[PDB]
């Protein structure tokens, strides 16, 4: 049982204090803006960072900073359950009940079904605006075990076209693909908001 830690949403001084506490525990810490297959993501708040969405898509633990504080004080990694984002839902919140429960929902759902990710068996073509990088979107999709179809790969079996300005594109242009078009927001909504 490994503890590969990443953090999202903390300012520098908060992150320094938390990483100092990791020296009391056997673990791996990965410093990167990118999702790097952490087993435990420590999140300052519910959010839509690459790390948060990717951790949801892979059914990882997404926990509060108290998980690190209390584990370090105990000298041992504790049970994650009561520290999970989703363990307790705030009925008066800017975040929907679905979004507040999303990390727990995906962790439990992937264990239930046996699937390795929220997007397993998806075969996705990305049509992202040419001025911006799709790289964070790709790493979230791949964290969920979607197959992102590169331009040099055959389009056989595409399931989703995810497109900048999907709602604007002409039917003639949508006709270049067998699969339906989805806006960029669909990815976040599928993980955080949609009732399955």
């Amino acid at each position: 049982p490994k503890h590969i830690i990443q953090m999202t949403g903390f300012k520098m001084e908060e992150k320094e204090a938390l990483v100092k506490l990791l020296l009391k525990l056997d673990c791996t810490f990965i410093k990167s803006e990118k999702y790097k297959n952490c087993t435990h993501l420590i999140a300052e708040r519910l959010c839509k960072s690459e790390k948060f969405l990717a951790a949801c898509a892979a059914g990882k633990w997404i926990l509060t900073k108290d998980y690190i504080i209390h584990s370090a004080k105990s000298g041992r990694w504790l049970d994650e359950t009561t520290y999970e984002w989703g363990y307790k839902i705030e009925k008066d919140s800017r975040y929907s009940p679905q979004m507040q429960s999303a990390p727990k929902r995906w962790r439990e759902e992937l264990k239930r079904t046996g699937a390795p990710g929220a997007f397993h068996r998806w075969k996705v073509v990305l049509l992202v605006r040419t001025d911006k990088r799709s790289d964070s979107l790709i790493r979230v999709l791949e964290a969920g075990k979607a197959n992102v179809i590169l331009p040099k790969s055959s389009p056989s079996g595409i399931t989703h076209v995810i497109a900048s300005n999907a709602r604007i594109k002409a039917e003639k242009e949508k006709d270049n693909f067998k699969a339906p078009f989805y806006p960029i927001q669909y990815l976040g909504d599928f993980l955080l908001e949609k009732l399955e």
């Binding site: 999202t8 949403g9 903390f10 300012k11 520098m12 992150k15 803006e33 959010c47 839509k48 960072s49 690459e50 790390k51 969405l53 992202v128 605006r129 911006k132 799709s134 964070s136 979107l137 979230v140 900048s164 960029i184 927001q185 990815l187 976040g188």
Partner: peptide, 16 residues
């Protein structure tokens, strides 16, 4: 800090 500037909303970043 430049060494701590991950986006907190990658969907928003792609919309505008």
């Amino acid at each position: 800090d430049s060494c701590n500037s991950s986006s907190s909303d990658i969907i928003r970043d792609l919309l505008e």
